[PDB]
Design a protein around this ligand. Structure first.
Ligand SMILES: [Zn+2]
Ligand SMILES: [Zn+2]
Ligand SMILES: [Zn+2]
Ligand SMILES: [Zn+2]
Ligand SMILES: [Zn+2]
Ligand SMILES: [Zn+2]
Ligand SMILES: [Zn+2]
Ligand SMILES: [Zn+2]
Ligand SMILES: [Zn+2]
Ligand SMILES: [Zn+2]
Ligand SMILES: [Zn+2]
Ligand SMILES: [Zn+2]
Ligand SMILES: [Zn+2]
Ligand SMILES: [Zn+2]
Ligand SMILES: [Zn+2]
Lengths: 251, 258
């Protein structure tokens, strides 16, 4: 089935997923000359104070860190969001070199990786029902630059050798995703979709402008395997056309 | 979330999202021994598990599965009602909350405490994926589990069940010999059946062994301690993970023995 190589990479997803050539595909290039400041955009409310991580798993496409989403404890409110969106998981996309790896780009600049924290609209009762609505998910995107070691990322780096290959998972409790944020919550936003199959058009994207720094920490990401050898690198979709959409800036 | 065996998503309710559940060749069925007639043209069953190469054991929230390397003809099923070679891809069990229930197939309406299913695909079609989409695609060998003395061959599988307690977990599971899970007698019944779980595709030549294997109360009590749910979700014990018998329709169950 699908993946990122020559055979099943983003080039070839349109074959089994016709929606890949759709109105609201993600990611996109965020052009800062055209992304205009909208003052009616409210400030972003992130409450991860009581987040409850459960496990970390390698699914042959990325690794995911899942959370208890049975209550409003780790939620996203404000910004462009009407209602409350609970945190279900986070994962990264990254590249084989430091000059590539982010899904979103800023003025065509690529970063070394991109952190995606996925949230679903509590309006629809569960994740499954949410994904089949345009306002179903909200993904907070955060760019990863090369620099000093992200102290908050170190716990996650730690545990990557015990989920080296596809199918493996480890218990992963008491993780604080506040530690993965930049200081500034300034963002861009636009009506996007999932960057992997099934590519459903159900995401309000929220991309943070301030990247977080990580150490040349990124070399542990690249040691993970796509297989259960093919190294898990360049697991990003390239930018898609922006079409009739408008990227709006909070700042 | 999706289908299972409870009150809201159990076999009663599978017809809702899987219309084939009310089809021509559903499994399991009650095997009635007064109507299942001995066919002498049925050949003897050839089981070659001498070189089987188990890889891993995983809890998928429905059963646990033990997977094998199926890239060569090393663990195969030939003879019996089968034209061609069927390689072993995995095995799993179905079981119940009590000793008086748990098997999918029944014999003269008798239920057993569990049923072992060794799944094989017809090498004719090149891979598992292509095989399931043909009536002669899979061959599942069914084996009934009675309560009695401890199955020495089952003990290595019992041993590793606490490290895959919940949905999504798996452990490395190498050098397992599935010969140790067989009864002495290979006498069987056979009929054109299908998968007993969704997607319930009608692609199985069923082969059910008549001689059950014995297991200990201690051994089956480890099955029942597994969870349908993942770590963190609320508790639901993995028991009664069997589909009840389905109508036989226009089919004929044939016996290898007098
Ligand atoms: Zn094409
Ligand atoms: Zn996949
Ligand atoms: Zn949940
Ligand atoms: Zn609520
Ligand atoms: Zn992503
Ligand atoms: Zn655990
Ligand atoms: Zn109905
Ligand atoms: Zn009868
Ligand atoms: Zn009779
Ligand atoms: Zn009769
Ligand atoms: Zn399932
Ligand atoms: Zn294989
Ligand atoms: Zn089965
Ligand atoms: Zn291992
Ligand atoms: Zn439940």
């Amino acid at each position: 089935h699908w993946g990122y190589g020559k055979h099943n990479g983003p080039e070839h997803w349109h074959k089994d997923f016709p929606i890949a050539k759709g109105e609201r595909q993600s990611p996109v290039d965020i052009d800062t000359h055209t992304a205009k400041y909208d003052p009616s955009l409210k400030p972003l409310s992130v409450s991860y104070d009581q987040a409850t991580s459960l496990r970390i798993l390698n699914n042959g496409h990325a690794f995911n860190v899942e959370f208890d989403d049975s209550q409003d404890k780790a939620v996203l409110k404000g910004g462009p969001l009407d209602g409350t969106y609970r945190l279900i998981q986070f994962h990264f996309h990254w590249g084989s070199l430091d000059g590539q790896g982010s899904e979103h780009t800023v003025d065509k600049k690529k970063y070394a990786a991109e952190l995606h924290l996925v949230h679903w609209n509590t309006k629809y009762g569960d994740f499954g029902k949410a994904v089949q609505q345009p306002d179903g998910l909200a993904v907070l995107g955060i760019f990863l630059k090369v620099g000093s070691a992200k102290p908050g990322l170190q716990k996650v780096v730690d545990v990557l050798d015990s989920i080296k290959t596809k199918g493996k998972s480890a218990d992963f409790t008491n993780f604080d995703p506040r530690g993965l944020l930049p200081e500034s919550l300034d963002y861009w936003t636009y009506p996007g979709s999932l960057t992997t199959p099934p590519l459903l058009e159900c995401v309000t994207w929220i991309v943070l402008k301030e990247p977080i720094s990580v150490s040349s920490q990124v070399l542990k990401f690249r040691k993970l395997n796509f297989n259960g050898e093919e190294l898990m690198v360049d697991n990003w979709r390239p930018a898609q056309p922006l079409k009739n959409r408008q990227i709006k800036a909070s700042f």
